DNA sequence: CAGCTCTGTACGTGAGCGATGGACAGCT
DNA sequence: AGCTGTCCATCGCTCACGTACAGAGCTG
């Protein structure tokens, strides 16, 4: 019944989510856009079965469990930040139209051309798909998880799409279904992070 | 025909909320 | 022993920052 401690949806739907963003990171993760959990927290993937923070501490990226009220230590702790393709909050995917989605993808290649991440994670295989058509002008059959093969115009930002770390997808029920994921974007971020030193 | 886009629908886990009722102590 | 109320284990149900896919409609 009440989820949000006697505070409205009507009242959640007006509240944003704020970025968390620096320069010279090496993640941002980027959802799709802020939940109701997350607008009543101010924080990023308070969900209590959002996979999120399980999967970063699984995978290796952090070296205990975080949880939402860490979000602000991620860039100078680990050197990832946080935006998302829609601003507005909404309570599932499927309430964005095409045009939120578009006029969020023109906003976010700006973000990315002015912070320049090392790579720039998509929670969300959707945001991708409009992301790339918008962006790069392209729509492939069957697009892929992992490592893009374009990099963020005028910058050397790779693209790496992850299944969303919302628990409402059943193709990954599990955060041990997504971790492969997030390990295989620590090695990313590794190799690039090593030939930088060397 | 055939390949495309668009829309509707079905899908596995695990966490939380409100209801239910057994266990139990305080009281007489 | 009988009564009463709280605690809390447990249950049923809902659902979470989606995703894959069938099939209708469209177009080359």
């Given amino acids: 019944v009440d989820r949000f401690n006697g505070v409205s949806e009507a009242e959640l739907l007006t509240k944003t989510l704020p970025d ?4 010279n990171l090496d993640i941002v ?28 501490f699984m995978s290796g990226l952090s070296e205990v469990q975080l949880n ?12 990832i930040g946080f935006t998302n393709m829609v601003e507005r909050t909404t309570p599932g ?11 969020g993808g023109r906003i976010l290649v700006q973000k990315l051309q002015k912070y320049q991440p090392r790579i720039a994670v998509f929670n969300g295989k959707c945001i ?23 990099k963020i115009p005028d910058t050397e930002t790779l693209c790496y799409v992850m299944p969303s770390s919302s628990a409402r ?5 599990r955060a041990q279904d997504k971790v492969h994921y ?7 971020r590794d190799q690039l992070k090593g030939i930088e030193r060397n």
């Avoid at 995917?93 to 006029?103: A, G, I, T």
């Fill in 20 to 23: 968390i963003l620096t320069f």
């Fill in 29 to 56: 993760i980027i959802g799709i856009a802020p939940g109701l959990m997350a607008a009543y927290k101010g924080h990023h993937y308070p969900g209590p079965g959002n996979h999120f923070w399980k999967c970063l």
């Fill in 68 to 79: 939402h009220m860490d979000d602000h230590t991620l860039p100078g702790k680990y050197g």
């Fill in 93 to 103: 995917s499927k309430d964005l139209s095409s045009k939120e989605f578009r006029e």
């Fill in 128 to 150: 991708y798909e409009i992301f790339s058509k918008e962006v790069f002008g392209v729509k492939v059959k069957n697009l892929e998880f992992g490592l893009q093969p374009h």
């Fill in 169 to 173: 997808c059943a193709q990954f029920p």
């Fill in 182 to 188: 997030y390990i295989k974007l620590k090695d990313l």
